[PDB]
């Protein structure tokens, strides 16, 4: 085998993308982390995918949790372990001590065990072996140097055996040492770390490959999600810039608007409707989702500010009936505070749902309500995650951003998303004659021509009604106009 390293895909949504193939075959991989990070899971799900997808029996070796439990719990993600032990496809090599015992059994067992292991490997024709909490073994009475020899005995042995491994390790500080003894670190051929960061009293799981000896991989941390279908990792960086682009158009929900956009919104594209509070962003959304119910199509609306009931209300008041929109299963409303989770868990829910309603249009009721309380670098990511998804998926995306300051705002956006958006719809207030009148403007469209003037507009029970530009005013943008009343040419 004089070839480049060989990797054996994991089938853990995303791991194979970050590891450019996955755990090098026949070698040991170390997945360490502070309690509650995934570990136990990761290895389980490691074996599983290996069996139910390539018929590569697995050897699981616990050092504390009783086999009966590894099963019990596994039922969490909808998979009966008891079945593969019955079909002899996975062997849970119980290695946890019993209630009673003795001591002074140091390297004593570390040896006998390498026999019971080689045992089941040969016996069950194993290929994927996972040992969870190897650490919970030396936590008997050892020091660094003692550990580095008991571990190295094993791996060295397993490599010989020809089995590809995954060792579990526990850490105390999320960013301190890689493993309880800073010894495993250099004893593994590839190291993986499960980080579960606090910050904001909210948590964010993150997986990383520190190293993979003999191959390239993806440097850095990646957010992952523990759900019902196991671990899931979105390689938001990995995602490529090869989205499909069409010159086909789609209505805005507002005719006169469509006209301004010179034909409408391209199907494959992202639209952003910015404007002070009140301007009516949520309006435009509402109307943009009905137009996808007239052409009998499925679209979704994610609201993080208003409720289910109130939305319906403020919707029946504008004419459009969502009640029906729901019955005719062509429209789906979500609703959830931004505080009920984190961008990682959100980016997913959006994705997930999107797969179970096969939308054609989609709008999020306020991104800025989603950036509420989270670092920019974190939000700017979340968007690139939903923005790209919808993109390489042919779904037209219109999002909502409520600028922090009404009138005079010097930026369609605060978090710095305009660069990410294709078409920009800017609603602003305009103080004329002591009154707060509106205005709508297609700030920019990347393909079309769109209307260059700032057209005023009012809101009635019939919905928006775009009007005429303030041709005779100045400083419109600022918000506080000034009439020219130019005395003609004065005759």
Ligand X SMILES: Nc1ncnc2c1ncn2[C@@H]1O[C@H](COP(=O)(O)OP(=O)(O)OP(=O)(O)O)[C@@H](O)[C@H]1O
CA 300 to chain centre: 18
| Of 93, 95, 117, 178, the one binding a copy of itself by CB under 8 A | 178
Return the residues of window 198-227 that contact a copy of itself according to CB under 8 A: 198, 200-203, 205-207, 209-211, 219-221
At 316 the three-state DSSP class reads helix
Contact with a copy of itself (CB under 8 A): which of 126, 191, 303, 315?
191
Residue 397 beta carbon to a copy of itself: minimum distance, rounded to whole angstroms: 25
State yes or no: is 100 an active-site residue. no
The closest alpha carbon to 227, from 305, 341, 128, belongs to 341
311 is in an annotated binding site: no
Residue 327 to residue 309: CA distance in whole angstroms:
15
Give me the least distance between CB of 434 and ligand X, in Å please: 16
CA dist., res. 3 & res. 97, Å (int): 42
Active site residue 174: no
Q: Does residue 171 touch a copy of itself according to CB under 8 A?
A: yes
Residue 478: CB minimum distance to Mg ion, A: 20
> 164 vs 348, which CB is nearer to a copy of itself?
164
136: contact with Mg ion by CB under 5 A: no
Task: Give the Cβ contact number of residue 449 at 10 Å.
Answer: 11
Rounded to whole angstroms, the Cα distance separating 31 from 225 reads: 16
- Min separation Cβ 188 and Mg ion, Å: 9
In this structure, what are the phi and psi dihedrals at residue 398, rounded to the nearest 5 degrees? -115, 120
Least spacing, CB of residue 35 vs Mg ion, in Å: 3
* Residue 257 φ then ψ, to 5°: -75, -55
> Which of ligand X, a copy of itself, Mg ion, none does residue 31 bind to, with CB < 5 to 8 Å depending on kind?
a copy of itself
Q: By CB under 8 A, tell whether 31 contacts a copy of itself.
A: yes
Bridge partners, residue 376, by sequence: none
Q: How far is the CB of 355 from Mg ion (least distance, A)?
A: 26
- Residue 29 assigned ligand-binding role: no
Residues 100-119 binding a copy of itself (CB under 8 A) are 100-101, 103
- Picked from a copy of itself, ligand X, Mg ion, none, the partner binding residue 460 (CB below 5 to 8 A depending on kind) is ligand X
- Spatial separation of the C-alpha atoms in residues 226 and 196, rounded to whole Å: 11
> Segment 136-155, which members bind a copy of itself (CB under 8 A)?
136, 139-145, 148-149, 152-153, 155
Per the CB < 8 A criterion, the answer to whether 145 and 182 are in contact is: no
- Which residues ranging from 22 to 51 are in contact with Mg ion (CB under 5 A)? 35-36, 39-40
- Please give the residues from 202 up to 261 whose contact with Mg ion meets the rule CB under 5 A: none
Per CB under 8 A, contacts with a copy of itself among 32-91 are 32-40, 42-43, 46, 59, 64, 66, 69, 72-73, 75-76, 82
Query: How many residues are given for the chain?
Result: 491
- Contact, 301 vs 285, CB < 8 A? yes
The helix (run of H) or strand (run of E) holding residue 122 is helix 106-124
Q: How far apart are CA 38 and CA 168, in angstroms?
A: 10
d(C-alpha 350, C-alpha 365), whole Å: 13
The response to whether 211 counts as a known ligand-binding position is yes
Query: How far apart are the C-alpha atoms of 23 and 209, rounded to whole Å?
Result: 10
183 vs 439, which CB is nearer to a copy of itself?
Answer: 183
Partner interacting with residue 317 (select from Mg ion, a copy of itself, ligand X, none; CB below 5-8 Å by kind): ligand X
- What residues are labeled active site? 64, 305
């Amino acid at each position: 085998e004089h070839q480049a390293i060989a990797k054996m895909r994991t089938m853990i949504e995303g791991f194979d993308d970050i590891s450019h193939g996955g755990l090098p075959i026949g070698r040991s991989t170390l997945v360490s982390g502070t309690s509650g990070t995934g570990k136990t899971l990761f290895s389980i799900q490691f074996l599983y995918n290996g069996i139910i997808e390539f018929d590569e029996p697995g050897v699981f070796v616990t050092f504390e949790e009783t086999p009966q439990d590894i099963i019990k719990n596994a039922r969490s993600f909808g998979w009966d372990l008891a079945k593969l032990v019955d079909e002899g496809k996975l062997f849970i090599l119980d290695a946890s001590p019993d209630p009673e015992g003795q001591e002074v059994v140091g390297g004593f067992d570390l040896s006998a065990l390498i026999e019971r292991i080689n045992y089941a490997i040969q016996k069950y024709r194993a290929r994927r072996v996972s040992i969870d909490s190897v650490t919970s073994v030396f936590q008997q009475y050892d020091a660094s140097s003692v550990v580095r020899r008991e571990l190295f005995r094993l791996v060295a042995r397993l490599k010989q055996i020809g089995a590809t491994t995954v060792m579990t390790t526990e850490r105390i500080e999320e960013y301190g040492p890689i493993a309880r003894y800073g010894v495993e670190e250099f004893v593994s051929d590839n190291v993986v770390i499960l980080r579960n960061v606090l910050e904001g009293e909210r948590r964010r799981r993150t997986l990383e490959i520190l190293k993979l000896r003999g191959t390239s991989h993806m440097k850095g941390e990646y957010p992952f999600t523990i759900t019902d279908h196991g671990i899931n990792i979105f390689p938001l960086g990995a995602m490529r810039l090869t989205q499909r682009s069409s010159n086909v158009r789609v209505s805005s929900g507002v005719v006169r608007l469509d006209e301004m956009c010179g034909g409408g919104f391209f199907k494959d594209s992202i639209i952003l409707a910015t404007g002070a509070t009140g301007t009516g962003k949520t309006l435009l959304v509402s109307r943009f989702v009905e137009n996808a119910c007239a052409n009998k199509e499925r679209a979704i609306l994610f609201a993080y500010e208003e409720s289910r009931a109130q939305l319906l209300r403020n919707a029946y008041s504008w004419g459009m009936d969502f009640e029906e929109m729901e019955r005719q299963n062509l429209l789906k409303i979500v609703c959830a505070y931004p505080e009920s989770a984190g961008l990682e868990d959100h980016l997913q829910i959006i994705k997930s749902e999107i797969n179970d309603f096969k939308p054609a249009r989609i709008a999020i009721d306020s991104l800025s309500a989603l950036a509420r309380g989270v670092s920019n670098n974190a939000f700017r990511q979340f968007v690139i995650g939903v923005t790209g998804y919808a993109k390489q998926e042919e779904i037209t995306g219109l999002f909502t951003n409520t600028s922090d300051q009404f009138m005079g705002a010097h930026s369609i956006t605060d978090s710095h998303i305009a660069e990410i958006t294709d078409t920009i719809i800017l609603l602003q207030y305009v103080e004329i004659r002591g009154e707060m009148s509106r205005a709508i403007n297609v700030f920019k469209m990347r393909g079309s021509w769109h209307d260059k003037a700032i057209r005023e507009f009012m809101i009635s029970d019939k919905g928006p009604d775009i009007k005429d530009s303030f041709r005779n005013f100045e400083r419109i943008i600022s918000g506080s106009p000034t009439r020219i009343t130019v005395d003609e040419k004065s005759e």
